[PDB]
């Protein structure tokens, strides 16, 4: 029953290291998510200006 407690402890340690690695991956993913959402919001504003602009070109041409 010694080698068993030994295994359980080994698995528990692996499960913990896995969880910590997952925490690291999730952290970098959140940073990218944040950067991406901020870019999309910016891009949304630029596309609104692009659309207003095209309306002006199309209008003044007529």
């Amino acid at each position: 029953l010694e080698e068993m407690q030994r295994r359980a402890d080994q698995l528990a340690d692996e499960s913990l290291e896995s969880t910590r690695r997952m925490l690291q991956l999730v952290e970098e993913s959140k940073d990218a998510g944040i950067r991406t959402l901020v870019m999309l919001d910016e891009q949304g504003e630029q596309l609104e200006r692009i659309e207003e602009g095209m309306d002006q070109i199309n209008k003044d041409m007529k």
Partner: protein, 67 residues
Amino acid sequence: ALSEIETRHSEIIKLENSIRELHDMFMDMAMLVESQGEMIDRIEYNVEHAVDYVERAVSDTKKAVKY
């Protein structure tokens, strides 16, 4: 024994909370992207329309110059 069980539990919960925020980021991302996609559809349309206008405008002036 107890301290370790507590730490592993705590780490897993902290991960689930972090993963819930990431899930939300992707959901919000798909929403924004689909919305901007509709604005892109329209812009694409306005651009082709302008291209034809401008192309005729230049053709007119080119013909004029010719004669």
